[PDB]
Amino acid sequence: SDSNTITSFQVDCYLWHIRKLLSMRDMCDAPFDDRLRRDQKALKGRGSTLGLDLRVATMEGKKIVEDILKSET
Amino acid sequence: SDSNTITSFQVDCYLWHIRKLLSMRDMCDAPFDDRLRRDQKALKGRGSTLGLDLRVATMEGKKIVEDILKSET
């Protein structure tokens, strides 16, 4: 799909990864875990339809987020 | 409320901030902007019932995320 659909998916994948780290550390509440579980299923489906490797998309999302965070300083 | 519930809210605020940076750079697609608008209302309503200042919660979320990212690998 278009460039921005891919970028949006990469960023969403990386932010999911951050949320997962919070949850694994047992630092979130139940609603936060429910959203994590539901978004995981949604991301897997979006990735399938886009043909995208979730692991690589997560790594690309990390670069993009670091990039835009650097630009606001 | 409970500690995990506050922490979840702070993290959600900071991740919304990141997503908003993406949108302000013309880097996201239309569904991503729709989720950003929906989640902004969600953070305002959740924050109001927890009593929390959204700007302070965003700053605290930044600290929490940077901290769990420090000890990743």
Numbering used by the authors:
A (entry chain B), B (entry chain A): 1 to 73
Tell me, in the authors' exact words, what the paper reports.
Encoded by the smallest of the eight viral genome segments, NS1 is a multifunctional RNA-binding protein, which is considered the main weapon of the virus to antagonize the innate immune response of the host and to ensure viral replication in a hostile anti-viral environment. This is best illustrated by the total loss of pathogenicity conferred by the alanine substitution of Arg38 and Lys41, the two main residues involved in binding of RNAs by NS1.
The X-ray structure of recombinant wild type H7N1 NS1 RBD (residues 1–73) was solved to 1.93 Å resolution. While it is the first structure that is representative of the RBD of allele B-NS1, its organization is identical to that of the other RBD structures available, forming a symmetric C2 homodimer shaped by three interlocking α-helices from each monomer. Helices α1 (residues S3-M24) and α2 (A30 to L50) are oriented in an antiparallel fashion, whereas helix α3 (L54-K70) sits perpendicular to helix α1. The dimerization interface, with an area of 1189Å2, involves 43% of the monomer residues, which are engaged in 15 H-bonds, including 4 salt bridges (PISA server). Three highly conserved residues of α2 helix (F32, R35, and R46) are involved in the stabilization of the dimer, with R35 being engaged in a salt bridge with D12. Nonetheless, the RNA binding interface formed by helices α2 and α2* of the homodimer seems to be well preserved on H7N1. Interestingly, another partial polyethylene glycol molecule is located in a nonpolar pocket found underneath the RNA binding channel at the RBD molecular two-fold axis (between helices α2 and α2*), making an H-bond with the side chain of R46(A).
